Design a protein around this ligand. Sequence first.
Ligand SMILES: *[C@@H]1O[C@H](CO)[C@@H](O)[C@H](O)[C@H]1NC(C)=O
Ligand SMILES: *[C@@H]1O[C@H](CO)[C@@H](O)[C@H](O)[C@H]1NC(C)=O
Ligand SMILES: *[C@@H]1O[C@H](CO)[C@@H](O)[C@H](O)[C@H]1NC(C)=O
Ligand SMILES: *[C@@H]1O[C@H](CO)[C@@H](O)[C@H](O)[C@H]1NC(C)=O
Ligand SMILES: *[C@@H]1O[C@H](CO)[C@@H](O)[C@H](O)[C@H]1NC(C)=O
Ligand SMILES: *[C@@H]1O[C@H](CO)[C@@H](O)[C@H](O)[C@H]1NC(C)=O
Ligand SMILES: *[C@@H]1O[C@H](CO)[C@@H](O)[C@H](O)[C@H]1NC(C)=O
Ligand SMILES: *[C@@H]1O[C@H](CO)[C@@H](O)[C@H](O)[C@H]1NC(C)=O
Lengths: 484, 484, 484, 484
Amino acid sequence: REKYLKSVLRELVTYLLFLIVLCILTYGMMSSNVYYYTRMMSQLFLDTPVSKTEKTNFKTLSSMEDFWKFTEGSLLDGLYWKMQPDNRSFIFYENLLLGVPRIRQLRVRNGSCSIPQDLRDEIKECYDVYSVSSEDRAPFGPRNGTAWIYTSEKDLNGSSHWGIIATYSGAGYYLDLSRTREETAAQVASLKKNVWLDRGTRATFIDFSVYNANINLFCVVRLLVEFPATGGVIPSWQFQPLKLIRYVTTFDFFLAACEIIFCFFIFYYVVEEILEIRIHKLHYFRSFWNCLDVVIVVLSVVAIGINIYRTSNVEVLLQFLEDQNTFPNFEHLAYWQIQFNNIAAVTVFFVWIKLFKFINFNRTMSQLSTTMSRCAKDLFGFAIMFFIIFLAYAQLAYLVFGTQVDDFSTFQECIFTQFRIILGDINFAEIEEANRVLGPIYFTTFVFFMFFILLNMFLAIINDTYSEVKSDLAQQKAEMELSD
Amino acid sequence: REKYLKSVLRELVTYLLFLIVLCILTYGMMSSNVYYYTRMMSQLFLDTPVSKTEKTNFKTLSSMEDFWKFTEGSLLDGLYWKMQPDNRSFIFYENLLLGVPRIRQLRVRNGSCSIPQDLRDEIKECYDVYSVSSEDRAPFGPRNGTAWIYTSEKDLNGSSHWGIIATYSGAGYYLDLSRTREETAAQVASLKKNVWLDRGTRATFIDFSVYNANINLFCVVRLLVEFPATGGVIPSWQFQPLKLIRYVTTFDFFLAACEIIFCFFIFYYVVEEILEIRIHKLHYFRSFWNCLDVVIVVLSVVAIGINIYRTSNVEVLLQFLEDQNTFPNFEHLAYWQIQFNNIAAVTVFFVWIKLFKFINFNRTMSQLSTTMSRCAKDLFGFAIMFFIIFLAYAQLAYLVFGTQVDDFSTFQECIFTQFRIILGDINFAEIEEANRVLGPIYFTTFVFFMFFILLNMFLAIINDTYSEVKSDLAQQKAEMELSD
Amino acid sequence: REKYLKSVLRELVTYLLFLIVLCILTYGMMSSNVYYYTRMMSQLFLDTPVSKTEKTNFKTLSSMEDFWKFTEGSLLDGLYWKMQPDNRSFIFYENLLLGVPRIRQLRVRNGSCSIPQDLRDEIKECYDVYSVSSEDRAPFGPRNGTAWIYTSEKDLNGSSHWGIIATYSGAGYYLDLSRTREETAAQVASLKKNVWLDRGTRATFIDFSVYNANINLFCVVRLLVEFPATGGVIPSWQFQPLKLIRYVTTFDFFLAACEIIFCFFIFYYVVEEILEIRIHKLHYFRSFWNCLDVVIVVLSVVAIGINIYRTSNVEVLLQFLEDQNTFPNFEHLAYWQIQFNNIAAVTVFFVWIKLFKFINFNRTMSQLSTTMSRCAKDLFGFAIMFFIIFLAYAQLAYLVFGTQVDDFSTFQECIFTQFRIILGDINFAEIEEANRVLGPIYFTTFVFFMFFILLNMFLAIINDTYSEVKSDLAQQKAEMELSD
Amino acid sequence: REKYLKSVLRELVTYLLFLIVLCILTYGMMSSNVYYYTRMMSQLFLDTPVSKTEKTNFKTLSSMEDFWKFTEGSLLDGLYWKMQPDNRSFIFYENLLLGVPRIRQLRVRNGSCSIPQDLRDEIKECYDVYSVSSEDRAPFGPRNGTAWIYTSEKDLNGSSHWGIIATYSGAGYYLDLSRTREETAAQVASLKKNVWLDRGTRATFIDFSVYNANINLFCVVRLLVEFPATGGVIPSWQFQPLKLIRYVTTFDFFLAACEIIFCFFIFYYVVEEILEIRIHKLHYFRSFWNCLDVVIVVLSVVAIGINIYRTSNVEVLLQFLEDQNTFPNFEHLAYWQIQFNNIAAVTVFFVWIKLFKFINFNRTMSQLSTTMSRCAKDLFGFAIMFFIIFLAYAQLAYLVFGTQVDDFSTFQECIFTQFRIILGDINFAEIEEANRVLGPIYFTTFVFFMFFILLNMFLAIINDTYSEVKSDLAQQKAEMELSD
Ligand SMILES: *[C@@H]1O[C@H](CO)[C@@H](O)[C@H](O)[C@H]1NC(C)=O
Ligand SMILES: *[C@@H]1O[C@H](CO)[C@@H](O)[C@H](O)[C@H]1NC(C)=O
Ligand SMILES: *[C@@H]1O[C@H](CO)[C@@H](O)[C@H](O)[C@H]1NC(C)=O
Ligand SMILES: *[C@@H]1O[C@H](CO)[C@@H](O)[C@H](O)[C@H]1NC(C)=O
Ligand SMILES: *[C@@H]1O[C@H](CO)[C@@H](O)[C@H](O)[C@H]1NC(C)=O
Ligand SMILES: *[C@@H]1O[C@H](CO)[C@@H](O)[C@H](O)[C@H]1NC(C)=O
Ligand SMILES: *[C@@H]1O[C@H](CO)[C@@H](O)[C@H](O)[C@H]1NC(C)=O
Ligand SMILES: *[C@@H]1O[C@H](CO)[C@@H](O)[C@H](O)[C@H]1NC(C)=O
């Protein structure tokens, strides 16, 4: 009674404070305005029409001509607003354009992959899909300024980006845009005249950044426009907000204090876990609750490391921007900001589920946790079998529909599409348009096996295992009644 | 036999009459035309295009320029219709514009939140997000009439409104529009010329009201246009119909009689409940059916109170409107009308579920109610655990997606989005566009745990508890067969 | 062995032939082209734009002006096609316009419902919602021709139609359009000039018909445009195809022979059922399979009656059309054609489920039918309770959302919306826009009770009852093993 | 121990290698770019607007006039791109138009089906729906060139296509388009002038092909435009990519080696299966795992046969194209390419499920496979009953909605629509617009029976059968405990 209950109360109170501190960190990271901030930026660049007298937008850029219309018209009419009655430009009035934008481009060599000898009469040229081996180093067109000559990824301060069809590395050819509107449009017109953008060009980035004074919040923009070798064009985007500068109001000091307290909490857990390793040399790794604790500790250490080694020291970049009007390179920081934010979120998710360990001081909740534990083995056993059939079905679907329907375009997405089908969300009209024989057969059979038969085995396994724990508890009550 | 069955018959008949009276009140409150009435009003103002030669509408106002186009063109061309061949204006011919509209505006001070010293070269101004502390009291632009000078919430007859991004209180700056069309457009043009609407402006209300003679039904309009500090614009609306005047036809007298009868019914319940409190001093609060009765009684008292203290005496406002052509302020009444309508609905919902108490005079229905009662404890025990995992998942989702996807924009909505995911309704394409690594992982894992494992524990708990009551009833039949 | 098996074989073979004949009738009624026939007609009139230089269509007619644009432009440019190089008009070339269209209108009296005395200064007129009592009999505008004078429902050959907001009876004011295009447009222009269509007008029908020579198929059109008293406009439509003339090819003779055979089959069933009534005077109505048989017999008699008393003798109408160029009134026949088609379908549905009676000559299928029979009582017992909670929830939803969201506009639809919610199809964004406090609460609670708790009681009832039949069969095998 | 485990290890390792080889074949067949290739082609022809100054596209061609606008404008402006500064045309620059397109047409005779004698005054012509009997052989209009004279399916090198409303066989009338743009437009204008396309015309194909040099990938196009006799127009499409030429890079040699290895694997299986037939003469066909093996063997033989007899020898066609500028007829090869791809996919699906046979060397997975085996009989027994009710419901729905809603247009699709309804995806608004009485009743009843009652019997059958295997294993443990 003395050692158990006191040690549980010691552990619980400290864990609850650790949770509260963790929830204060999450509340500080995410301000509730932020959504609307990014939404307005997206509306400006993505959703708006390209020119005044047509339907098309950024989201559905089809041609190279279309992309050229976007860069000349609506890209600029987003970035450069006529000054309110120096000549520094704002967005929406409230947001500040930092320095200038940048148009970057990669390109692939002439004859980078060999053509079959059957069609050597007609075709005298070829360019294959992006890879670091096949990327062009040589000059291009007019030999004039930085815009046309290649520059390596260590020469620039740029990193690799994970694009849609393929990963695009570092940099090659790039123009820095002007701070004024009329000079920019002249530079873009000169690029269009001399055909800077052509067949062989693969990845094109339009990058820049903004800062909102009102809520103290930087934000970067990365308009990637992939050109697949196939022919047409694929777009994407990224709007990452970013609390770059920290210390301003009383709320920030309070957030800073919590982060320091979190550090001491993590330190205490690390001591407590590894003290227990000294006691139990090889008996410690098998218990579930301890394993979960170690994972929370490791994530927290990684979060701290990302915060200290990288995210803190970056103020050097911002100080360089303060003294000039050139391009400011945030892009490398944002990449770590997202990664930090990811890891913190997963930490929170695991921290909340750990709370279970101190729930079972009531009878009913205790029996349910014992049911869940005993069923785990059977469910895991079934889960393998379920996945085998699931992944075969996905492979079938990929082989049939891969060409036609967006849903199953890559194998990565095919799984997730099938998961949506189980719930109740599917683009059936498109499947049926792709293949009228097998398409609906795949769909019927999948529903018939997965939804009526196999998903109910999970249930049957749980069901019976619950009944067996209730009978076990009834016999414990009846056998105790017989003994007394 | 005598005391039980007679007292049940006494209670049942009186309860059934109380239910019928309650259903007559609900039928009287809601006329089946009402939907189409509000639909036509919404179509006029929300859905229509802003100007003649463009795509945009009210629902997707992006810029301040856009809002200005709406107020000058389609707002007025909704309100003011060319008289059919005094000069009083109608809507659709059948509806009557009451008096005039009102354009209200709030605004925040210059330099209400401090700027960081790193960017003190470029930025010389700032305005933070709405709060009562930071709201501007001082004058503005031309010092001319009521439109530009501040007025407090007790000086005006206006209340606080619960807006989208933040709660907007009382009033500040406001113009009353003209009764004719051509004077209004001149006043709106003069506002646009002198920049009455600028950076720093937060909440803007366009209010007015209409009355339909044909079905005797007033209706208010509240076009709120929020300006978040971020930069752009967010719209909303509210179309509340309102049976203001009552006594006209034989149907209204019948409705009035029912409301009076309902009053005596409630009075009788109150006596019956509190007479039972005198009998059972501390044994009464634990039984479910009695607790439900007390809650129905409290709601009914609150409904009566809202009807008498406020909703009835408001005819003073309507009488003031009858003698003039100025702005009529319905807005304060409507707020209570909705609250009444809410509470009445919840009363009805609880009243219907109370009917259960007099269902169990058949064997099968009795066993099911006994199953539901015994399972309640286990289900409640599980419900806590289910919610812990659910709310952790929501917290994870909020941390990942909060910036990108509309669905999880606020924590309040994040829960409800997850509930939709379980059923079969989700915007998957948007999640995947926000975060390709973790986004679909969150979705898979959530489906895997919640939909295949955890939701089936509810079922398993019910299932086994039903089987145990059936075995208990079989042994009661078999043990009675052995005794006889 | 002799009496049972022979009598089962006698019954089965005759029933299978009756089923095959019934499936031949259904195959004959529905030709697989028919869908595309109606689809093209709908595209022409509903989906197309009103004028050349605007967005709006028939489906979203908002104003009276809009309706006037439709009748003058796209209505006529659908009906009248420039003759291919008599002057008889076609649709798509392949379809034939029969005679002419008709524009019918109803109207309500001046001051049909009394106005409150508070607003007697401004409002000097009123018109209430459609009813037969309040419908106007008197003349109107210019006293000229049939178009402006009222005519009763027995004077015309027209019936009542079940409209959307209210049932519209017979007729009142109507113009028959011309056979040529240029005369029609002059008549429509003259109506628009003198304001034939005004405030007080309620229901407006644009009726006509077409005949396709190519597949031998008539089709009627009923463009109803309701004007609710509220102010705006509501549209609907109806495109009923119709095999009017029968005897042409060998397929029709074969269909006719099957219908005659079906008649003798029904006759034989009637004798067989009522012979069994003579045997078992009051022991016959309780068994399920016999009850189902009687219902199939009654429906078949009703189907035959509708076929003979009405649908056959109508050729008189078609013969009158053959001799002239006036309006042909199909409308009364179509009403019975749909009713016949409904009843036949329900007959087929019941006939197929009757097949169960001759399935149970295998052991496994027999046990399942015995499980389904024993569970019926409990499920029925639960079904009542389930519906009580369901209908309370619907009543709550109706009281909250009735004004705002289309989904719950009428109580009839509210039920069906809730059924969709359970499956996985809901317009959540609209509910949340209607009421942010209670709206999502209604949705959460409904999902929590209905989807996690109550729908699984059905399952639990079945589950346990199946297990009890399996134990009963195991003891029958074990007790038979002990006896032998 | 020696014979079992060694023979299992022999079988397992060889099967795993066979699986890996099979997965290498699938990875080789489907390149991850392919989706985007077909997507860009579809965007060009389907989604784009017809003319510059209107809304309509290919997907929603309504009229013959509309089709004529497509062929004259956007068809050509897709195919023919202005040469970059011989005169050979490209698509997107990166893709190559092969030779030329082809416009093919079928037509039906005058008076092919007899008209009723009641309407012999007005109608003097008729054309019925496509069939080989009724197809026109005779000449047409100007007797000039190949475009107007009929040619049979054995005279041409063309096959039958499975269209939407009806199967269209071989060929009749066809024009080969020019290699240049300006000659094509003159030929299309001459067709439009002399009314080559008229009433009576049924199927129209616009065929051509492209080749991408960059990724070595041919692709065919088949723009079918069906004219139903009803009146209007129905479109469809088909974009089949095709790896025609093989041997180029090291990856292809590796793929070729794997295909040869697969051949020897299949050969070994065939010997192993039929060696076992020699041993067990009539005891072999009843076991499940052997039956599955035979089916995988048969599919593989069919896949090999399709690869050798047809898909390999087709290079003759490509060699004929290399020497000329005429039409190249790929169409016959593509048909087999899809069929091969189908069969391979189904082979993969079955191969993956075969893996189960070597899973059961752990206790938990073994019990689940024994549960699944014993339940199979009951589930199969229930499945029949379930389908009877399901197919009756479908028949009911078809009879009601067949005319109105797209969903249930054909009986083939009606089944699949009902399957979607169970999951949570349904167009409810359309059903309700088709029939307000019975429409929602069908939907309620279907949900009530199928979703709450019948789908849970599957579950109940599994549930109890799992519990019975767990009790059987518990008694095997307890009886073994008693014996020891
Ligand atoms: C591209 O490569 C081909 C084949 O090697 C060659 O004939 C041609 O001259 C090259 N063109 C350019 C512009 O480099
Ligand atoms: C090269 O760049 C200069 C400016 O540095 C510009 O004036 C000139 O037009 C460019 N050369 C050519 C050939 O266009
Ligand atoms: C706004 O505040 C800043 C900083 O205090 C000040 O320099 C400026 O004069 C103010 N402007 C106005 C218009 O009040
Ligand atoms: C002030 O208001 C008056 C009308 O009361 C108006 O005539 C005048 O234009 C306004 N003053 C200025 C400076 O615009
Ligand atoms: C309509 O009724 C009102 C009230 O009875 C009356 O004053 C008016 O003259 C009537 N007008 C017409 C056109 O009948
Ligand atoms: C009455 O109808 C006649 C044709 O019958 C027409 O000429 C005349 O215009 C109509 N009367 C008036 C006043 O318009
Ligand atoms: C079509 O057939 C009808 C009926 O046999 C005949 O009168 C007519 O001359 C035919 N027309 C043509 C163009 O063949
Ligand atoms: C027949 O075809 C020739 C070309 O071969 C063309 O010149 C002529 O216009 C055509 N005949 C008629 C009558 O159009």
